[PDB]
Amino acid sequence: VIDAFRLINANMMVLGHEPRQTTSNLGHLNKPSIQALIHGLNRHYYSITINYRKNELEQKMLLNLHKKSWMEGLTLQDYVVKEMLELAKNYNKAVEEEDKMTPEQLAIKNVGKRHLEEHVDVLMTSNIVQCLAAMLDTVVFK
Amino acid sequence: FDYKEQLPESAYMHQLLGLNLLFLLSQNRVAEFHTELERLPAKDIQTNVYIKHPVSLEQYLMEGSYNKVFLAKGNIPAESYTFFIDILLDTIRDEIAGCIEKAYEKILTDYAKKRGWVLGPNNYYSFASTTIPSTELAKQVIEYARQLEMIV
């Protein structure tokens, strides 16, 4: 929500406010446009374009921070996973079985001038990962 | 094979054909054996005694020729195949090896001495006769294949 403002004197208002000599940057500046309250008090002011300073070392350090710290990427404890999986798959199987009625009716209906349910990518990923865990189970250890 | 419409049938044709048939069984090309059989449907039928001996032998082979080894030999001593039958006879089948003998059944010397005994493989017939991690490697590849499809 941060923003940057700068005031304009009332002496040169006869002269142009902000002499513009670049279309791309002026349009980018206008893209934020002006806020409701901003117009309510936009006068004697003219917002100035802001941007995050180039960031590589800090960017790289943060990126390394995320994997291990800001989300689960310890990579050594990275791999319930066999306890609750049965129950999660039970829920989703029952739900998909139920949802299968709506496509049935949809097909039943003629030309006549909620089948899209997906629910399969989730199962795919979850149980394929669980099966892959065999790789850790049988080789990575012992 | 040649059309040879003028081909004058001779009793030799039947005699020689059976010699292949008898030999073919001798060279355990059983598939080829039937191949020739179906090539002469009009010959076998019920006549052509010349070639009737091999088929009886073949039937006995699929059946228990082991007992009928000398039954077919005595069924007809000769059919112009005096030597022809000899090859088959000396080529005694020995598939019975998948059993127990030699002080365990004792019956079925020189046979018990050939290559040390019987044909050579195994030992004295009286004294003749799980892992997930190994599965791990094979399964791993299979699972990725399923994923590989879900790429695009």
Swiss-Prot record, chain A:
Signal peptide: none annotated. One of its GO terms (molecular function) is metal ion binding. The modification Phosphothreonine is found at T102. Widely expressed. Highest levels in heart and skeletal muscle. This is 26S proteasome non-ATPase regulatory subunit 14. Keywords: DNA damage, DNA repair, Hydrolase, Metal-binding, Metalloprotease, Phosphoprotein, Protease, Proteasome, Ubl conjugation pathway, Zinc. The modification Phosphoserine is found at S69. Component of the 19S proteasome regulatory particle complex. The 26S proteasome consists of a 20S core particle (CP) and two 19S regulatory subunits (RP). The regulatory particle is made of a lid composed of 9 subunits including PSMD4, a base containing 6 ATPases and few additional components. Within the complex, PSMD4 interacts with subunit PSMD7 through their respective MPN domain. Interacts with TXNL1. Belongs to the peptidase M67A family. PSMD14 subfamily. It comes from the Eukaryota. It comes from Homo sapiens (Human). GO terms for biological process: double-strand break repair via homologous recombination; double-strand break repair via nonhomologous end joining; proteasome-mediated ubiquitin-dependent protein catabolic process; protein deubiquitination; protein K63-linked deubiquitination; regulation of proteasomal protein catabolic process; response to ethanol; ubiquitin-dependent protein catabolic process. Component of the 26S proteasome, a multiprotein complex involved in the ATP-dependent degradation of ubiquitinated proteins. This complex plays a key role in the maintenance of protein homeostasis by removing misfolded or damaged proteins, which could impair cellular functions, and by removing proteins whose functions are no longer required. Therefore, the proteasome participates in numerous cellular processes, including cell cycle progression, apoptosis, or DNA damage repair. GO terms for cellular component: cytosol; cytosolic proteasome complex; extracellular region; ficolin-1-rich granule lumen; nucleoplasm; nucleus; proteasome accessory complex; proteasome complex.
Curated annotation (Swiss-Prot), chain B:
Residues 1-133 form the PCI domain. Belongs to the proteasome subunit S14 family. Component of the 19S proteasome regulatory particle complex. The 26S proteasome consists of a 20S core particle (CP) and two 19S regulatory subunits (RP). The regulatory particle is made of a lid composed of 9 subunits including PSMD8, a base containing 6 ATPases and few additional components. Interacts with DDI2. Interacts with TASOR. Component of the 26S proteasome, a multiprotein complex involved in the ATP-dependent degradation of ubiquitinated proteins. This complex plays a key role in the maintenance of protein homeostasis by removing misfolded or damaged proteins, which could impair cellular functions, and by removing proteins whose functions are no longer required. Therefore, the proteasome participates in numerous cellular processes, including cell cycle progression, apoptosis, or DNA damage repair. This is 26S proteasome non-ATPase regulatory subunit 8. It comes from Homo sapiens (Human). The gene is PSMD8. The chain holds residues 176 to 350 of 350 of the full protein.
